[PDB]
Amino acid sequence: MGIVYEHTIRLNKAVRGKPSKKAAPIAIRAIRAQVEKLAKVEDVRLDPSVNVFVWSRGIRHVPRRIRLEVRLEEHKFAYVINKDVENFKHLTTEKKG
RNA sequence: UACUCCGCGCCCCGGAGGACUGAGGGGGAGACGGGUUCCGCGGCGCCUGCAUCUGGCCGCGGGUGACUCGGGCCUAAGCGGC
Ligand SMILES: [Mg+2]
Ligand SMILES: [Mg+2]
Ligand SMILES: [Mg+2]
Ligand SMILES: [Mg+2]
Ligand SMILES: [Mg+2]
Ligand SMILES: [Mg+2]
Ligand code: NA
Numbered sequence: 001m002g003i004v005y006e007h008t009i010r011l012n013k014a015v016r017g018k019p020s021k022k023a024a025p026i027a028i029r030a031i032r033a034q035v036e037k038l039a040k041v042e043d044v045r046l047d048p049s050v051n052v053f054v055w056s057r058g059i060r061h062v063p064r065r066i067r068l069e070v071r072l073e074e075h076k077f078a079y080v081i082n083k084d085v086e087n088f089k090h091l092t093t094e095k096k097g
Numbered sequence: 098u099a100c101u102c103c104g105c106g107c108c109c110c111g112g113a114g115g116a117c118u119g120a121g122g123g124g125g126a127g128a129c130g131g132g133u134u135c136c137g138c139g140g141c142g143c144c145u146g147c148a149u150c151u152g153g154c155c156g157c158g159g160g161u162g163a164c165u166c167g168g169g170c171c172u173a174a175g176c177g178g179c
Contacts, residue, residue: 055114
């Protein structure tokens with residue numbers, strides 16, 4: 001039926017309080033949990049594009065913000081895609097389909 | 098110093114990303130010692146102080162070619178015989 005979400009996650013907020021030597025894997029787990037909360041599902045599959053974006057600065061200094069693209073797919077699962085944006089000014093959740 | 102995503106599973110394999118050993122090497126080869134640990138196929142009963150679909154583990158088959166490389170010859174420090 002084509003239900004697609006658009007959302008941004010603050011990655012620097014999700015690694016507050018954790019050692020910097022494990023920033024990127026912690027960010028991956030935070031992305032998965034937040035997506036499960038947003039899509040009301042339990043099976044989240046991340047595209048390697050978001051993985052590349054998350055690791056683009058090494059293991060310590062993750063990018064500050066990321067804009068995601070969630071498309072829902074009695075066996076429902078969410079597929080997440082990275083969307084590249086020029087700026088995050090005045091960007092909020094959009095619900096399409 | 099260290100893993101992550103997807104196929105597929107933190108540990109096997111593949112692709113993509115991120116790192117490390119840093120030419121007195123966690124590289125490439127020999128002497129001594131070990132003695133089949135080497136290779137292919139199959140497997141997880143034991144072991145692989147977590148797991149295992151992995152393995153120097155278990156089963157079945159294979160594998161080392163010299164006129165020119167080394168030993169066999171010479172003699173050293175020595176040893177033996179007379
Ligand atoms: Mg270095
Ligand atoms: Mg050799
Ligand atoms: Mg072998
Ligand atoms: Mg054996
Ligand atoms: Mg010769
Ligand atoms: Mg000869
Ligand atoms: Na690689």
